[PDB]
Amino acid sequence: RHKILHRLLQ
Amino acid sequence: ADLKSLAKRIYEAYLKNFNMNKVKARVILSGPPFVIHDMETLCMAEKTLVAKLVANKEAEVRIFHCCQCTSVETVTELTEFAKAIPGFANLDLNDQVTLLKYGVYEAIFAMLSSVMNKDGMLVAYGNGFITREFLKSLRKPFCDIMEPKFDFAMKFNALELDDSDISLFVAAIICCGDRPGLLNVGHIEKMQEGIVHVLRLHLQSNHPDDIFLFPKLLQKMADLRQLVTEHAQLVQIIKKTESDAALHPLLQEIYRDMY
């Protein structure tokens, strides 16, 4: 639901 | 546990990860930033500081775009900062996302206060100063974006926090265990309890003159949640009714299903 946040968080 | 050391760790993480902080801002505000007080000086500032943007739509929509770009940058800084709060990186990735989704604009408006005074605010990495009256002069609905944030900031700045306080306040905003949709509420509540305890003791040490500073800041956290709810409603009106005022995809993801 938050692919950019998910990507930033990894 | 060493709570003075935890406070220092979070302050050091804030100094590393945020391009703007209150020390830097005050050096600049003390007097160089290009002053944007009218349409002529807006257009001049754009040609120097955001040249590619005007190499055109209405001035209000250009300003909206510049606002969003700053938010995108600050969300990225907040994501790296959050990785430094104890327990945050041990959470499920899905809960890390949720905490950031709800917390980033509360943190943005808290930190925005550091670049504001009663007459205007620093923009473009401290190279512009846009006046509060100019922003009020924009056509509706764009003139309604910043004024509530100035009103919050004038009272927040009157608390006379420094960056060591703000770093902990921003960490406590991010570690709220009552965000909608959290999976591991119990672990997040304990993480929050620990950060809030560090904040409490730090304020006691750093502000011995103001015995209510901790409950004042708990209230400011609640004020910020309400400010963000109202801001999200205005963003939705703009998105729906202003076709030139596209939302950046990271911000669309943050706002989608938020409130």
Ligand SMILES: CC[C@@H](Oc1cccc(CN(CCCOc2ccc(OC)cc2)c2nc3ccccc3o2)c1)C(=O)O
């Ligand atoms: C509109 C939708 C947008 O709302 C807002 C509302 C209020 C504040 C912001 C982000 N913001 C203001 C940047 C203005 O940026 C320019 C740049 C250049 C310019 O003219 C040349 C005009 C404005 C900001 N500043 C900060 C400084 C320090 C810490 C956090 C900071 O956050 C976005 C959203 O919801 O994302």
